[PDB]
Design a protein around this ligand. Structure first.
Ligand code: 3FD
Length: 539
């Protein structure tokens, strides 16, 4: 009946469903609300989820994980080549694509990353079906905001292979914002910072929500920073302590290191709520029992550099979004590692004591929002687009930013581009792209009779006026003569849907770097030509 929302993560995945007016995070066959993104191949069977991770020490060369780091990418990507050196399983090239290679029932088998992701999605689908007691078909799957079209199509194909109808691919930070209802808040546009610290990845996203529209302003972070690194800091600390007390290095014994790491991770999770935790391991190495403790302050000291360095991607995302820290309206914690009190204190002090949105389980908020969006897609006055004019080089110069309260009036001064320019062609465009090629022409009019003058000397005042009904009047005045011209543009008729605005905003997101590189190509910013650039001859 209902559609599910799936957070397909690198190490863990989550599935939720909106029923009875409530989002429910679905527990698996072992009772866990999150399922490891592991696929294991043995002599007899294919294990997925908890069963696959529970035997990783026994079958490490045939237990696949972190397949999300490969999906949508080609084999010769530097990211893939760098990640291959850290995995116990083999990665091979097949016509320019990476594949994981394992042994299964005594035969060598290779799978594309989307195939392993399809196995994980099959597990999540079966979990949802066991919970709901019916076949689940429609689903919303989330991806990192920095995913390109290829990676998103690969994730959708992974969904399709698993028998899922992928209604839509949405961004994980957007899903986290939807779970908190930040798109349903009253007032002007809101700036949202999603701080996502999981088991092995760290993602900072800066979005702007305006009239229910999500625009990804910036993304940053560290693809190899998570709770596993904190566990490893603890493990090295305790190995040093054991070597210092009992004069023995336990690094030689793999099982001792495994037991120590499990104890350290559990003690870390304890330290999120207590100021100290105990480590009790019987016969850790050479019969010696290891019974010790660790304070929260010592744990923070062991991870001081990583904890404090989480703030640098925040600064980078703020700079790339052209926003001050005080301009952020909402802060959303996602990922289990955000339960660490020192991380929360660092983030809150950085924002001068602002409260953090953390009431939703940070391991489940992405699947929460995905389920909300799946239920929406299954059944559950401001300006819509930026308005501007074409300036020299055919670039878009915006006078009324998107999501501006009407009625409004905005005036800007422009000038001529060539010497002795007799007139200017005011060309009104609507869109979120830097070049007028990729925007929508609404109208144009000419302003002639400009007295001969050098370039940059004449002054042309251009005014955009939007009344309460949305009727757009654009006027141009020669400031040296008072001569004027104008045009009226009917901004009505329901010509745009919410999906149209979302598509235009996401296309502006996709070509952000090229739009920036071509916007600053022209030297002057308020120079008007006399012709239409998009109708000029080019090779
Ligand atoms: N069951 C279960 C389960 C639930 C969620 C996750 C995902 O966790 C990913 C990252 O989140 C880390 N983490 C988590 N993870 C949530 C979690 C909850 C319960 C269990 Cl049994 C486990 Cl072990 C993990 N809690 C933390 C905490 N309280 N303090 C510091 N770090 C915590 C976790 O150690 C890892 O670094 C993994 C397992």
């Amino acid at each position: 009946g209902p559609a599910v929302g799936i957070d397909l993560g690198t190490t863990y995945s989550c599935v939720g469903v909106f029923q009875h007016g409530k989002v429910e995070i679905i527990a698996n066959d072992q009772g866990n609300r999150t399922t490891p993104s592991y696929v294991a191949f043995t002599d007899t069977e294919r294990l997925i989820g908890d069963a696959a991770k529970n035997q990783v020490a026994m079958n490490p060369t045939n237990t696949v994980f972190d397949a999300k780091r490969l999906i949508g990418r080609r084999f010769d990507d530097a990211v893939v080549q760098s990640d291959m050196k850290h995995w116990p399983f083999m990665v091979v090239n097949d016509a320019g694509r990476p594949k994981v290679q394992v042994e299964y029932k005594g035969e060598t088998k290779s799978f594309y990353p989307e195939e392993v992701s399809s196995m994980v999605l099959t597990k999540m689908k079966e979990i949802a079906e066991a919970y709901l007691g019916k076949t689940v078909t429609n689903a919303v799957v989330t991806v990192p905001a920095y995913f390109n079209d290829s990676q998103r199509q690969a994730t959708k194909d992974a969904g399709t292979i698993a028998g899922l109808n992928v209604l839509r691919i949405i961004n994980e930070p957007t899903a986290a914002a939807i779970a908190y209802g930040l798109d349903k808040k009253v007032g002007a546009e809101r700036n949202v910072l999603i701080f996502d610290l999981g088991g092995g990845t760290f993602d900072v996203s800066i979005l702007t929500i305006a009239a229910g529209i999500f625009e990804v302003k910036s993304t940053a972070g560290d693809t190899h920073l998570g709770g596993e690194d904190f566990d490893n800091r603890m493990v090295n600390h305790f190995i040093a302590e054991f070597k210092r007390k009992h004069k023995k290095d336990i690094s030689e014994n793999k099982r001792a290191v495994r037991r120590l790491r499990t104890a350290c991770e559990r003690a870390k999770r304890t330290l999120s709520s207590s100021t100290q935790a105990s480590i009790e391991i019987d016969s850790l190495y050479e019969g010696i029992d290891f019974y010790t403790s660790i304070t929260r302050a010592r744990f923070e000291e062991l991870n001081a550099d990583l904890f404090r360095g989480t703030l640098d991607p925040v600064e980078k995302a703020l700079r790339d979004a052209k926003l001050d820290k005080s301009q952020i309206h909402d802060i959303v914690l996602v990922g289990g590692s955000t339960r660490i009190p020192k991380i929360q204190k660092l983030l809150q002090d950085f924002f001068n004591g602002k409260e953090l949105n953390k009431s939703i389980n940070p391991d489940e908020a992405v699947a929460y929002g995905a389920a909300v969006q799946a239920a929406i897609l299954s059944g559950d006055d401001v300006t819509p687009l930026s308005l501007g004019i074409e300036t020299a080089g055919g670039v878009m110069t915006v006078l009324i930013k998107r999501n501006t309260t009407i009625p409004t009036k905005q005036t800007q001064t422009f000038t001529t581009y060539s010497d002795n320019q007799p007139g200017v062609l005011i060309q009104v465009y609507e869109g979120e792209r830097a070049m007028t090629k990729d925007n929508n022409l609404l109208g144009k009019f000419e302003l002639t009779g400009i007295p001969p003058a050098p370039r940059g000397v004449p002054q042309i005042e251009v005014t955009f006026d939007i009344d309460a009904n949305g009727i757009l009047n654009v006027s141009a005045v020669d400031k040296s003569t008072g001569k004027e011209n104008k045009i009226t543009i009917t901004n009505d008729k329901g010509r745009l849907s919410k999906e149209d605005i979302e598509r235009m905003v996401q296309e502006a997101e996709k070509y952000k770097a090229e739009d920036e590189k071509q916007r600053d190509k022209v030297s002057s910013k308020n120079s008007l030509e006399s012709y239409a650039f998009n109708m000029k001859a080019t090779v």
